[PDB]
Every structure is written in structure tokens, then in C-alpha cells.
């Protein structure tokens, strides 16, 4: 009976909200009250990559911390020289329609994907030396809304059909599928193992997924609205989201509940996008109202404003060594922050 | 680095084709339920010149418009409407007769305020194509339409005078065409500004007018564009 | 968690009246436009009424002025649909729905097939 398994779901989820409040005898500020705040953050715009057309969806860091290619609605995938500002690539893209762009942690291939349902996968170290397509993953039913590479061969997706999908880039073959969310989702992130992976959904809520067995390890609720970005601590034993709220919220995957908020009564705007420092001390996040924002991710409070964007704060990346920080926006320009 | 400064070049020049190409073209998002015809002018637009969306190519004296038919999308549109704003306008197709869901025309009323009124879209020209003319002019000359009950501001509705009628029409038929404009247009007055405009337009499925329908109003977008840049407007 | 719960659904005789109440809970009610959605037997969802953020803005559905009232009560965090002078055409399950993006003017998405932010819905029988 559909009645019996709902009063059982409400009683699941009364026992889950009390083991919760059980473990929440001590907030974090209490016992981040020994460490001193950083103060303001008055970063510096150094580089203003120039060259995409349309509004930027996507970037994505090497691991070089050098090179970082860019996805544009225009539909073009530009791949920068951080350093010295020179375009290395520039792949003109089938579906102008991306949402979303990968760099491979070996360097030699990236990954596109958006309205068309579709991730394309472009390989950089051609024979010929010209970036050519070469793997097409399909298979999703919605909008493909983030893409990210585990390695040579494989590589981590996320659909607005409310799943995410783990595919063997060799073969073509989805090898392994994650659903039960109830909204869009709309932003994942890798462990640092590169074992689990959280995913943020139009539903308020965040999933801990195990990649190797394909279920949902952990569900974190707290949110508001849609969740539009998110990103793992540095330790990988935490993690924040952004959400249409205007609230940020960082959740610790063994305390399975919210630790932090991140919020101002001056801010009535979604955030796009977050990105955790190397240290984890600091949580940049896009906003909507045109803005980037360093949060003191330990003390909550605003340690610092990315202003000089002229349009919305799509994406942010920040380099693996923590040397600096890529915002890309709707304005079509990359900015360089350190 | 001297290498790396001729890939750069190399691809600049590129670059700046790609831009000459780029702002040629007037990119346009098509819109509506697929009951409303919304297809039916798309066979149209494309026999005149999976896939999560499909796009369609024409050109209108010697102008090369693109089309976006968001197929095989859910019905949640909230997220992937966002990355419309940049779009010369937004084709909302209406299927007009679907009065008496119980009232599609009341979910097409909501889904237009809804894009009318989004932050993304304010800035977002709609084209609207209440596209369900021959079958609203059969409902109502038959008697089975009663809108009334539906709208009951439909009980004292008169039709504006400068409403022109199309020719041999019956009177109500253009009272109910123009009543339901009426409504669309109350939606979009409401909170306009002269950032965004609605071009409302009694269109058929398979009319053939609807290229030039969009051709004028796209050029009328982009005058109005410049004169807001001069602060004409 | 986003809950929404609706009770005072049941019985009543063509012609008569009753009391929809939805207790909304997880977010800050006043910061939300809410909906009332309806979804009848053999049909989809359909959109009755909504109300803004402090209740000065109100619209229903054609098929309802004069016959229904929405209110919301911002202190308690709860929504009210007073039905008056019911018809059998009413017979539907009533979804008291919030659309997601707070401190805006756009409600996308209230009558979607598989919606998030909306409640389980309680049964009017006319």
C-alpha cells in the first residue's frame, strides 16, 4: 500500500531528523571561535581573457594551473594560456547551446556538453596536431549541465534529467548510472579520491553518490531553492553549495547535516558558483548580482568582493597549486584574480 | 614563444571570422506547448529554405535567422530558459482555442508572465503567436466555445476600437481573438519599461506569413535596441 | 527540507463550501509567491489561484473568481483556500505549490509533472 510506505518515509525521515539534531550539540562557530578572521581580501584583477562572444558557462582549470579552457555560448571551447594570455586552441562546437566544459587531468582531452544532450569529448594531442572530435556520449535525456573527467577514460556527467551518468570514454558505454534526484542537477564535484562524488539538484537538496557502487550514499537537505553549484572541501570530507536562495551552505559528509550558512541580508541573488581555496579557508562564490564573493568559509562572515564583472558570475575555477582565480561571466570575459 | 604567439595569432584571425560570422546571424528561441502548432511552423520555416535541441536555419532577405526548437527537454523550464536571454526574441507560440488541462490557455497565460517577468528575460523581446486562429474562429461560431465561463471578464469584454477585424469575420470571433491578446497584453504592460516588447500576432499554423511576422519584428528589436543606446528610448 | 502539507479537504454537496489549509515548512514563507494547483481525475495540473509575497497581489483561474479566496497567513506560515459555492467539476486533488526562486516576480515551473517545491495535495470530493 502507497499509504504504508509514506507514513513509513515520514517515519524514516523523523528518526533522520532526530539522529541529526542528536549530533548537533555544537555549532561551528563555537568552535571556530579560536581562530581570528582574515580580514578583507582585496584581490586584483591581472589577466582579462578576451576573445569568447556570448555569455561563458563554463571554464575549467588544468592541472598544470597554466592552461584553462572556456566554454561560450557562441559555441566556441577556447583553450587559454593563462600565463601569457594566448589562445592555444579554439574548438568550434557543433551545439553553440554548452553549458558546461572538462579539461582531463592528463591534459590531452576536453569535454563539452549542454542543450543537446550530448558530451563531446575533443582530443588536444592529435597526430596532426588540430583538435578534432572524438568521442560522442549520449544517452541523456535532459540538458547536460556539468561534465567532469575521473581520467584518460572516463568521465563523471550530469543531466536536467534528473541523473548522473559515469561513462567509459573508449567504448562510448554508460558504465554506471545515479539517480534519485527530483530536480535538474545542475553542478557536480569529485572527491579528491575521486571515489564519491556530491551532485546538486533543482530540489533543495544534495546527493553523496559512491562511483563505484552506483548508489546514493548520502542525502543533505538544508537549501531552500534550486542548488545551482557545488564543490567538495579540500579534505574531501566536506563540501558547499550554492543555491537561488541567495544562501551558501557547507555540509560535512560523516556529520550527514549542514555546518555553515553563508548569507547577507543585502543579498537577495542566487549563487552560480563556488569554489573552495587550496587551504579551504576561503569559499568564492558567483553571483547574480554581477558579483564574486570571498566568504571566510570557518567564520561565515565576508571577507571579500570580486567586483568588475559586468554581467553574471557563471563560473569560477580555482588553480590546483592555489596560484589564482579564473571568473568567467556573462559579459564573455575571464578574469584572473590572485 | 614565438611559436606560441603564431598559434595565437593564427587562431585571432580565426576569431574575428568567427565574430563577422557571429553578429550576422540573429539567434531565436522558439517556444510553446506542442499542441499549440509550434512544430507545424517549424515543417513550415523548414521546407520554405533525441537531439535535445533543434535548430533550424533560414534566411529572410538575405538576413540569416537561426531557430531553437527545445526538444526532448523536460517540462521544467526554469533552468535551461537562462540560457535564452541573448536571443533576439523569444517565439512564444499560443494555442489560442485550447480553452475549456482543463485550460490550456490559462497554463499558456502563466508560462508568459512567468517569462514576461524573469530577471533573465526582461531584457528578452517575445514574439507572440496566438496560433490557433482557424480553430478558435470554428469554436466560437459553433457556440461550443463559451469563454465566459473560463474568463468571466469575458461577460463585459468590448472589443477596442482600434482592433481591426479581418475581413468577412464574425464579430465574436474577433472579440474572442482580440480578448485573449487583451490578456496577454495586460501580462505584458504590467511592469514593461521599454527594456523588453511583446508583438502579439493572430497567426495560423500553416501560415506562411510567419517568417516575414518574425523578420519585421526582429528588425523592429534591434531599431529599438540602438535607439536605447542612444537614449532615444 | 522544503514541506508542504494540506488538510481540510473532504466531503461536501454540490453547492456547498469548505476550507483548504496548507502548513508550509523549511523556508521563509514570506519571501515566496505561493500557488494553488489543482490536478482532476483524467486531467493535468492545473493552476487555480496565487498570491505574492505579502498578500497585496492576488489572481485566480477564470473557472474560480468569485467562488474561492486566497489568503495567506505570513505569521503562522500557512496558506488558506476558502471554497464557496462548490461544483462537481471541483472534484480534484488541491496542491498548495511554492515556486522556487525567492524575492521574484517569475513562478516558473508550479504545474510541472514532477515539481519539487509542492505539496502532496488533499482530496475534494463535490
Known amino acids: 500500500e502507497l499509504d504504508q510506505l509514506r507514513q513509513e518515509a515520514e517515519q524514516l525521515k523523523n528518526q533522520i531528523r532526530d539522529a541529526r539534531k542528536a549530533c548537533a550539540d555544537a555549532t561551528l562557530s563555537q568552535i571556530t571561535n579560536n581562530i581570528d578572521p582574515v580580514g578583507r581580501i582585496q584581490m586584483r584583477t591581472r589577466r582579462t581573457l578576451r576573445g569568447h562572444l556570448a555569455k561563458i558557462y563554463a571554464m575549467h582549470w588544468g592541472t598544470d594551473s597554466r592552461l584553462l579552457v572556456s566554454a561560450s555560448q557562441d559555441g566556441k571551447l577556447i583553450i587559454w594560456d593563462s600565463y601569457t594570455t594566448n589562445k592555444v586552441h579554439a574548438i568550434p562546437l557543433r551545439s553553440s547551446w554548452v553549458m558546461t566544459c572538462a579539461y582531463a587531468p592528463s591534459g590531452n582531452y576536453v569535454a563539452c556538453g549542454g542543450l543537446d544532450n550530448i558530451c563531446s569529448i575533443y582530443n588536444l594531442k592529435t597526430r596532426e596536431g588540430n583538435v578534432r572530435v572524438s568521442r560522442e556520449l549520449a544517452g541523456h535525456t535532459g540538458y547536460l549541465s556539468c561534465c567532469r573527467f575521473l581520467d584518460d577514460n572516463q568521465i563523471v556527467t550530469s543531466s536536467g534529467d534528473t541523473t548522473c551518468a559515469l561513462w567509459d570514454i573508449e567504448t562510448g558505454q554508460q558504465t554506471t548510472t545515479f539517480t534519485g534526484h527530483t530536480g535538474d542537477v545542475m553542478s557536480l564535484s569529485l572527491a579528491p579520491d575521486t571515489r564519491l562524488f556530491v551532485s546538486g539538484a533543482c530540489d533543495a537538496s544534495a546527493k553523496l553518490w559512491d562511483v563505484r557502487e552506483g548508489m546514493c550514499r548520502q542525502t543533505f537537505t538544508g537549501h531552500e531553492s534550486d542548488i545551482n553549484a557545488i564543490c567538495f572541501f579540500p579534505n574531501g570530507n566536506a563540501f558547499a553549495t550554492g543555491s537561488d536562495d541567495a544562501t551558501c551552505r557547507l555540509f560535512d559528509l560523516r556529520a550527514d547535516q549542514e555546518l555553515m550558512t553563508y548569507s547577507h541580508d543585502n543579498i537577495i541573488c542566487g549563487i552560480t558558483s563556488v569554489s573552495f581555496s587550496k587551504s579551504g579557508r576561503l569559499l568564492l562564490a558567483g553571483y547574480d548580482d554581477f558579483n564574486c564573493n570571498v566568504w571566510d568559509a570557518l567564520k561565515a562572515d565576508r571577507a571579500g568582493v570580486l567586483a568588475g564583472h559586468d554581467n553574471r558570475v557563471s563560473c569560477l575555477g580555482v588553480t590546483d597549486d592555489g596560484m589564482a582565480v579564473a571568473t568567467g561571466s556573462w559579459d564573455s570575459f575571464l578574469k584572473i584574480w590572485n | 614563444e614565438k611559436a606560441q604567439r603564431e598559434a595565437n595569432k593564427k587562431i585571432e584571425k580565426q576569431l574575428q571570422k568567427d565574430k563577422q560570422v557571429y553578429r550576422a546571424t540573429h539567434r531565436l528561441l522558439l517556444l510553446g506547448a506542442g499542441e499549440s502548432g509550434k512544430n507545424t511552423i517549424v515543417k513550415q520555416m523548414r521546407i520554405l529554405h533525441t537531439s535535445g535541441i533543434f535548430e533550424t536555419k533560414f534566411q529572410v532577405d538575405k538576413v540569416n535567422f537561426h531557430m531553437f526548437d527545445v526538444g526532448a527537454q523536460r517540462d521544467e523550464r526554469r533552468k535551461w530558459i537562462q540560457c535564452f536571454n541573448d536571443v533576439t526574441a523569444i517565439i512564444f507560440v499560443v494555442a489560442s482555442s485550447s480553452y475549456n488541462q482543463t485550460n490550456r490557455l490559462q497554463a499558456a497565460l502563466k508560462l508568459f508572465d512567468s517569462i514576461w517577468n524573469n530577471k533573465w528575460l526582461r531584457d528578452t523581446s517575445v514574439i507572440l503567436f496566438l496560433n490557433k486562429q482557424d480553430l478558435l474562429a470554428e469554436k466560437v461560431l459553433a457556440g461550443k466555445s463559451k469563454i465566459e465561463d473560463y474568463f468571466p471578464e469575458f461577460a463585459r469584454y468590448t472589443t477596442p476600437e482600434d482592433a481591426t477585424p479581418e475581413p468577412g469575420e464574425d464579430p465574436r470571433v474577433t472579440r474572442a481573438k482580440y480578448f485573449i491578446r487583451d490578456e496577454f497584453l495586460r501580462i505584458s504592460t504590467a511592469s514593461g519599461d521599454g527594456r523588453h516588447y511583446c508583438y502579439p500576432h493572430f497567426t495560423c499554423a500553416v501560415d506562411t506569413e510567419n517568417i516575414r511576422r518574425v523578420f519585421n519584428d526582429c528588425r523592429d528589436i534591434i531599431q529599438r535596441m540602438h535607439l536605447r543606446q542612444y537614449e532615444l528610448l | 527540507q522544503v514541506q508542504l502539507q494540506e488538510s481540510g479537504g473532504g466531503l461536501v454537496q454540490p453547492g456547498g463550501s469548505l476550507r483548504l489549509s496548507c502548513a508550509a515548512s523549511?523556508?521563509?514563507?514570506?519571501?515566496?509567491?505561493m500557488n494553488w494547483v489543482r490536478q482532476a481525475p483524467g486531467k493535468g495540473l492545473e493552476w487555480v489561484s496565487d498570491?505574492?509575497?505579502?498578500?497585496?497581489?492576488?489572481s485566480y483561474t477564470g473557472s474560480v473568481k468569485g467562488r474561492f479566496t486566497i489568503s495567506r497567513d505570513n505569521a503562522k506560515n500557512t496558506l488558506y483556500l476558502q471554497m464557496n459555492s462548490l461544483k462537481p467539476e471541483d472534484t480534484a486533488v488541491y496542491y498548495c505549490?511554492?515556486?522556487?526562486?525567492?524575492?521574484?516576480?517569475?513562478?516558473?515551473?508550479?504545474?510541472?509533472?514532477?515539481?519539487?517545491?509542492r505539496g502532496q495535495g488533499t482530496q475534494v470530493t463535490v
Open positions: 523549511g523556508f521563509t514563507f514570506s519571501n515566496y509567491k
Open positions: 505549490a511554492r515556486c522556487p526562486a525567492p524575492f521574484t516576480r517569475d513562478c516558473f515551473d508550479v504545474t510541472s509533472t514532477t515539481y519539487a517545491y
Open positions: 498570491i505574492s509575497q505579502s498578500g497585496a497581489s492576488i
